Design a protein around this ligand. Structure first.
Ligand SMILES: Nc1ncnc2c1ncn2[C@@H]1O[C@H](COP(=O)(O)O)[C@@H](OP(=O)(O)O)[C@H]1O
Length: 288
């Protein structure tokens, strides 16, 4: 059974066992100067931004963006599972310009990205909404260990004992990294509030100037209501053994503030006290 195993340490970070097993392929990954890397802590808007980028690259052409599932159009680089998928292989075989997905902490990113000085789009999301999204994702996406109860999972999340390690260090170190490499550092909440503004930021970062009409096409097709029902974007093409949407759909709620529905008041107060200690020295600021 490739599913439901315990995580394995890779350079200090808990990762899926099969990523650890095939780490050589990941560490030696060959980037290209025109790769665009989408980098996120899990559940922070990866799919949303991936779809936006593929829409941009296809001039808003919805049919072209249905050429394959999002996880084939924008490969999850480090995800290697025996008999199931190999993100590195998928990317090696992909023509430029490539859009690459990762969740690796900064210190684990393949060094080729730095050597090629790639542009990177990092997406962050408020921690409370992330842990809620991640709890349900752990339940449905069977590569993860069992999450246990919400209480148990929340404690694991606070302790960084989850796939890809602690949220706190992930977002903080990627934020610091923006001084060394070209990183457009976006917030899920900003995309919720004014998606047009955020897509315009992406376009500027990519040095692309497009007609208003194309921008509006991209906006329309990247909305939650459209993506939720789009089988090329909503992960329903995944084998049921890998993702069981009857447990929880991938496109779950797509809002900011679902944390209020999940956290008890006591859990919230405890989480905030812990958060302040971990985050007060970083210049990073979030809305919940
Ligand atoms: N177009 C969109 N607009 C808003 N949220 C979206 C979205 N597409 C996906 N999401 C949300 O992004 C989260 C998945 O993130 P990732 O792609 O990084 O795994 C899920 O959050 P919820 O579980 O809070 O609904 C999902 O519903």
């Amino acid at each position: 059974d490739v599913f439901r195993r315990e995580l394995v340490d890779v350079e200090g970070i808990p990762l899926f066992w099969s990523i650890a097993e095939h780490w050589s392929q990941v560490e030696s990954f060959e980037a290209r100067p025109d790769d665009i890397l989408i980098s996120t802590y899990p559940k922070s808007g990866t799919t949303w931004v991936s779809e936006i980028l593929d829409l941009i690259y296809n001039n808003g052409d919805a049919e072209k963006c249905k050429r394959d599932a999002i996880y084939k159009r924008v490969p999850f680089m480090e995800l290697i599972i025996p008999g199931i998928t190999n993100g590195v292989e998928m990317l090696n075989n992909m023509p430029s310009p490539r859009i690459v997905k990762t969740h690796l902490p900064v210190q684990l990113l393949p060094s080729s990205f730095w050597k090629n000085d790639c542009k990177i789009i990092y997406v962050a999301r408020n921690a409370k909404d992330v842990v809620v999204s991640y709890y349900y994702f752990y339940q449905m996406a069977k590569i993860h260990p069992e999450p246990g109860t919400w209480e148990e999972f929340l404690e694991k999340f606070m302790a960084g004992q989850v796939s890809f390690g602690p949220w706190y260090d992930h977002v903080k170190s990627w934020w610091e990294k923006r001084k060394e490499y070209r990183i457009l550092y976006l917030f899920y909440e900003d995309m919720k509030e004014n998606p047009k503004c955020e897509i315009q930021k992406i376009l500027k970062f990519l040095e692309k100037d497009i007609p208003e009409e194309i921008l509006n096409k991209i906006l329309y097709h990247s909305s939650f209501s459209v993506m939720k029902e789009n089988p090329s974007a909503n992960y329903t093409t995944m084998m049921k053994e890998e993702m069981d949407h009857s447990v929880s759909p991938f496109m779950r709620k797509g809002i900011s503030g679902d944390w209020k529905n999940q956290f008890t008041v006591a859990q919230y107060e405890k989480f905030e006290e812990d958060y302040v200690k971990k985050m007060e020295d970083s210049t990073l600021k979030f809305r919940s």
